[PDB]
Design a protein around this ligand. Structure first.
Ligand SMILES: [Zn+2]
Lengths: 187, 9
């Protein structure tokens, strides 16, 4: 753990987003993401805009429509709630910005897609390292607080198509300004 | 393309 070595350290968090989550009729807590707005600005701007609802649409009231234990939880389909919908603030879909960042471990936030250059509003939150998705899905954030809430969602009962048996809803969401951007660990 | 300060190592 020598500090010189240590300092030579991942991307800087430039803005935060919160989700307040519900499972069935139960409040389960807040998750806070730190987003890498200097590394993937276009991707971060899309996520943050959808969290604030500033374009007249976005994540509020949408579901986590797929949960796979020891893999990830997925949501952001605010138009159909099943993985076939959603749209970006740039149009239906938008290209892969870069693959600078990897799925380093649990709690990393990455764009769902249906092939090259098909990013919309759908995202997933890893609950393990998912290195097989590196270079194919655009990573743009990390859970900073509330990983325990993520784990509650991850463990919720699902049907045979990995759909939660109780709806897991984003009850509220929004952005939190970060005055002094700060680097986090690549893990 | 890379920026060490903002993207990390
Ligand atoms: Zn150290």
């Amino acid at each position: 753990g020598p500090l010189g070595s240590d300092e030579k350290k991942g991307p800087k968090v430039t803005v935060k987003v919160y989700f307040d989550l519900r499972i069935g009729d139960e409040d389960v807590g807040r998750v806070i993401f730190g987003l890498f707005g200097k590394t993937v600005p276009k991707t971060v701007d899309n996520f943050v805009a959808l969290a604030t609802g500033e374009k007249g649409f976005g994540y509020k009231n949408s579901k986590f429509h797929r949960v796979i234990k020891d893999f990830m939880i997925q949501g952001g389909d605010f138009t159909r709630g099943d993985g076939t919908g959603g749209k970006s603030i740039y149009g239906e879909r938008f290209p892969d910005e870069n693959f600078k960042l990897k799925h380093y471990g649990p709690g990393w936030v990455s764009m769902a897609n249906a092939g090259k250059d098909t990013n919309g509003s759908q995202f997933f939150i890893t609950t393990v390292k998912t290195a097989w998705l590196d270079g194919k899905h655009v990573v743009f954030g990390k859970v900073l607080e509330g990983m325990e809430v993520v784990r509650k969602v991850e463990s919720t009962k699902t049907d045979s198509r990995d759909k939660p048996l109780k709806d897991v809803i984003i009850a509220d969401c929004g952005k939190i300004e970060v005055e002094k951007p700060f680097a986090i660990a690549k893990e | 393309d890379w920026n060490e300060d903002m993207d990390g190592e």
